[model samples]
Target: AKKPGTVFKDCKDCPEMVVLPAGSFTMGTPDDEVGRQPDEGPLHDVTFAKPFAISRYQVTAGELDAYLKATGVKLADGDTRPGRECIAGKPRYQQGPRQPAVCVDYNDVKNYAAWLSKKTGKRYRMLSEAEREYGARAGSAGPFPFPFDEGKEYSIAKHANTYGASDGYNFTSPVGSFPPNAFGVYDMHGNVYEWVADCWHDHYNGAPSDGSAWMEEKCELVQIRGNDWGEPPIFSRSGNRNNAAPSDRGDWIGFRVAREL
Candidate 1:
């Protein structure tokens, strides 16, 4: 029930998959976190006992288009791309279907993951913050959101479409256009921000280990992760935090898929 033709892909049919090692590490931002918002404090440790295959980048335009073409669901391009609806609040940055698909909510992302799992015969779900950070850092830490010490300008700038109207790019660049993270993942910090599986917790207090979701039956809190274009430099920090209603969607929100092992 998304309006038809509202999703599209900007890359080829498949994105690379990166394998993460099972290990223990801290998750969430530190208390003195530079970009720490009220919600990003009280960080904690998370342990992943099992290894799983993770997406090397967000699903691209070509990847999403294949799904849309098969399901006959309408697809969209991200900010600055074309073929977008003219609705007043529709958040215009869509282009062709090859860019990172944007302007969607958590529900849409969940539906797409379910559909993809059925089609691909593989499990698809969101990555936990611990997993996301581990993969991005490849076991390294940095003052910058990404593991790379000096490539923010070169890598994310070229890889993702974030930093929107201010950056003059207006929309997302092609997936993986820039250098990969330590784990060979691209666009983990920008492009469109990836949605994670954990429920929103005001802080990372008493988080889960063993790579499971932080769940609440009522689902009061859900994590909206990473940062995107049009955000403050603080927002782009690795420890930045955000959340939304499960049904909410926006121009800068969407997700990559992860498999449970």
Candidate 2:
């Protein structure tokens, strides 16, 4: 764990987090970014009220292992193989548990956060789509084409193991291998798609204007934001979005840790 510097780091071993001052940013892909997905559609304005502390890094394998040991709920296991399944880059025989734990569904993410909140007594929850984009933007007002500043060219070799870059890997890589976004959050654009809190709707129809989640509709499926390494660079953008049934599980879908004030 890194040395503590602020109240946000007061929680034992919490990653160094920077407080995002309250502001507004354009959420979703820009009209000009290449390979923009349709689901990131109907892009709109999103504003956050008070500043919130976001993890400086995605939940590391080491941190996740501790959670599994304490709660007996394995969110990610580095020692587990592709287990009775065959995926593109899965080991034929052995597998290390430290790689990001894939095969976790939306419910698993929620349950783990809930358990951690109970144990730590902090308001731990997944970020909303709005908050997720805001955190990824790192206070940049423009809808960044990549996780970094707008109109910058990002390499898959630098940020992730996308098809164009890596000779190996169709799955997650070791956490913290890439440079973090401006807000100091790592892996926001790849490794694994993060499960956000809001229920999924067909489009951004009647979405929340403020940063609060849109929990009123019967939109049961949870929205998954950010892209995973399995996807091409298009989905790897900070504003890229997807969703799955809370019960759905897959190889490139995992989650990070978030807390509320």
Candidate 3:
């Protein structure tokens, strides 16, 4: 008994996905906003012609472990831990199965999505940059999905685990440890950088206004959204953007999945 365009859990193992309604939103950040990047400007409108489903949280280590077990697939060459450290005299940075899956490259996430589609018989894929921003906004016009005080950094420090803002976690937290957005999406700000399908672009120049992945014939770099656990408040802004080589992986980079409907 699921609603047509509200929420969905196609299978018990499938992601708790939310069916995002189709609508238009002004994408990118305003020129004067703090932490505004040159690549985020030239704001434009994007509309999803139809509703689509996106995972409510970042794909967890447990979820990816299940996929790897089913396919007998191992992490790619560069998909190793960022580094080793000691936490309370114990090993830190261990892959917590319940936490967001990190040390994963774009290619790794792509294969996982393919495996999910084959298993579930559904079209699972990465979100486009346009689609990500839309979901992050979640019907709010503010730079963040939550109410933020631009005048004070403490406002975000309370909610997000930035470098100076103490949210009690030094690394990624378990998915849904924080509050969700109006659209019922969680960790759209600070958790891990979620991968998008769009290719790297220096700026918004000549970008598509429609909600589709922007790519060139032989794009080498991929876009990653959201801020990681140790980054600053500015990096957690909904409009903040960055990219990495497709083959690269680290503790901070991870992704959520989107399903076409």
Candidate 4:
């Protein structure tokens, strides 16, 4: 009975989600973008004909713990680590249960979806690269949701928690630390780099345009989006992207979830 723009949670332990209607957006960056990565280019448009629900916030420690406790699943120790010490040896960089969960590899994300589905009876899953961009962009068409002039990337601190922001977290910040995007989804521009369901491809030459996961049967790598702390605003741009082995979880990495509406 929910509708587009509706925000809801299936269970108390579930992450809050926002409903997004079918929409279109231009993915990838143009050559003139500041700090544009070579792989971000050959800009193209993508369309989603179906509505979907995406977690309102990146998966947090408390939610992850709920799944672990329920399934008796103990994640392999510390792909998401740095131990108990603060980044740069500073207390401000200390991590906590409210922060975005990291060190979770692609497999871990899939496991979370399975558990979430079993508990909520909804098809919880990761998003495709096109879907991720549509949600992340909300409706903005610029390099960011806000206006950006050449060489004024520092202004991003007013909206997101990235390196160009006021203080250096040097580590990830708690979810909701920054404002949400136009779609009511938080931390899309920064916080922690997030995984998408697409397999790695150096360019968009054959990328999917239907908001589906561009995957292969024997994939060795996956695409990731959203920028993380310890990186500048440029890297956090909506068009910016990177790829890594699905098993190579980094402390800088985390994930969110999506479901068909």
Candidate 5:
């Protein structure tokens, strides 16, 4: 297990990842949570028996460009364009290379990780749902990684970019625009709904407790956590959960990378 502040990068051009200490935390939401989902309960304890490394920030366009250049592979036509459904009008990929790479499908991330592994000779995978939540919470047991006061401390501008709120962004902000969690991971609360390694299960009935990825045969739906640029506040909670088809890509979805030490 690594110490709290240990940080490393797999390759010179790769995203910087941090070593999270091995510890245990409760995995789901309590009943009184404002936007609790049935799938988020029965809250259970999960332990990361060993330390693992996770990207301090979501994968950025610059990092993706580096991977593509190294592999000499071109993104399939039209895939580079952001999914227009989410953004109204002009609806293009407004993000710069420094911003999180959204409009990415599950297969895209899988292939990205595979390419990264081939180049670095290191294992790079998407965070499992359990690991994602544990990291999101950053040792806190609250609904959010940070204090989210519903009435007194609400700031719609900082949390999401929506109509009338004018948080200065209609698309994604740069990867680290928001504050980091206690473990030094950024954008875990509101920015983009990150793709995870697990297939969608209606509930946590048979979930793993050792913080490993859960898989099933023909698992079409995959889960994504955290809220996006224009989503409601409830979706930003650490315990919040949502899923999409493996083939579906949208402006609001992106992913963070994880590695086993």
Candidate 6:
């Protein structure tokens, strides 16, 4: 019942949610766009017929901590540190609670949506691959989400946290450490590669145009979007795509939350 771009949280500790407008956009990369991948084609239109809410930031370690405490579910890993996170090849104490919770396997995030739903009584869920691209582009029909200087390779350094290309953090920064996109969503590029709802597809050939998750009966590989701290600039492009098994976990992987409005 609220207008798009409005931000709110359903619970005291729920993920801060941003209202995204109902609109359409190109779902894949164009041939002439820089860093265009073969899988990011054949470019097609996707429409979100209704408004939705997405977490303003990637799911943070503190949020995960709350979930674990509420459910008595410990991370399946043996890293005896807080959040069990291992990033930048450094000790996790150097990492803080505001950082995205990485190194937790994909299903941990998959379980978080349900935990959040039961806690808040809202339909909290993972975002569709198309919705991730839509939020990342933030109405810009460009390579990256935010505006950039032409003819300069370093333009994205200020907008994203890709690798150590800039004098930025060597590891994931706290959400909102960088500027938000036009949609007022933060870290849609490099921070950690965010897990989305769709199962893996080689290309957008048989994808849905209605902005829904494209899942198979026995989905094995899941789609991940955005770039991670350890990855180069190419992976931060709005249309780039990657995948990992749902059982997979890594230092550079985490997730964002989505909710029905």
TM-score of each: 0.78, 0.78, 0.90, 0.90, 0.89, 0.92
Candidate 4: lDDT over CA atoms?
0.80
23-142 per-residue lDDT for model 4 (tens digits) = 788898889877888888679898888889999889887788788789888676443344532221112345687788776778889999999998878899998888778887888877
By lDDT rank, best first, the candidates go 6, 4, 3, 5, 2, 1
Any runs in candidate 1 off by more than 4 Å, and if so which? 1-12, 74-91, 145-161, 164-168
Tell me the tens digit of each residue's lDDT in model 2 across 64-85.
5566677676343223344534
Candidate 2 or 6, higher TM-score? 6
Between candidates 1 and 6, the lDDT winner: 6
lDDT of 6 at 258: 92
For each candidate in the order shown, give its overall lDDT on alpha carbons.
0.62, 0.64, 0.79, 0.80, 0.79, 0.84
Per residue, candidate 3 scores C-alpha lDDT tens digits across 1-261 of 234236776676667798888889988899988778888978888888888889988888788778877878767544334454322112246557768877677888889899889988999999999989999888776678776656775357545555643676777788887778888888888878888989999888888887899999888898999988878878888888999988777777779999987
**Better-scoring candidate (lDDT), 4 or 6:** 6
Candidate 1 displacement at residue 44 in angstroms = 1.9
Give the 10-residue window scoring lowest on summed lDDT in candidate 2. 86-95
Tens-digit lDDT string for candidate 6 (1-261): 979999999987788999999989998888988888889999899999999999999988877777877888867653444654554222254468788877776677779898999878889998999999999999987787666645685457778888884727888888888889999999898888999989999998989999899999988899999999888888898899999888777778888999999
Off by over 4 Å in 2: 1-18, 74-98, 140-154, 164-170
Candidate 6 TM-score, true structure as reference = 0.92
lDDT of 1 by residue, 1-261 (tens): 222112322234644566666777665566675556776556566677767767777766566656667777653333344544322224566545555666565666777777867776777777776677666656554435343235454334433445655344666666666676555667666666777777878766777776787777778557877666655455665666677776555566657777644
Clashing pairs in 6: none
The CA-based lDDT of model 2 is what?
0.64
Give per-model CA RMSD: 7.4, 5.2, 3.6, 3.6, 3.4, 3.3
